[PDB]
């Protein structure tokens, strides 16, 4: 159903968070808005 | 220098944003805090 890209995006983000991704990094990514 | 993991994390996050990653998704990831 969900696009390949969309699916890849969601899976990749969960994988990062599971791996230890810092809040600082996410705050940095959100800042581009 | 930077750990393999750390390096992978940063590269992966930029790749996601470049690909189109939504703000909603990042807001969802930040929310776990």
Residue B25 contacts residue A13 (beta carbons within 8 Å): yes
Q: Which chain B residues are closer than 8 Å to A3 by Cβ?
A: none
Q: Please tell me the experimental approach by which this structure was elucidated.
A: X-ray
Element (H, E) at A23: helix A23-30
Give the residue carrying structure tokens 């990653």: B21
Q: Give the whole-angstrom CA distance, residue B29 versus residue B32.
A: 6
DSSP-assigned letter for residue B17: H
Task: Give the closest of B5, B19, B27 to A19, CB-based.
Answer: B5
């Amino acid at each position: 159903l969900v696009s390949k890209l969309s699916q890849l995006q969601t899976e990749l983000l969960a994988a990062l968070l599971e791996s230890x991704l810092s809040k600082e990094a996410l705050i940095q990514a959100l800042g581009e808005w």
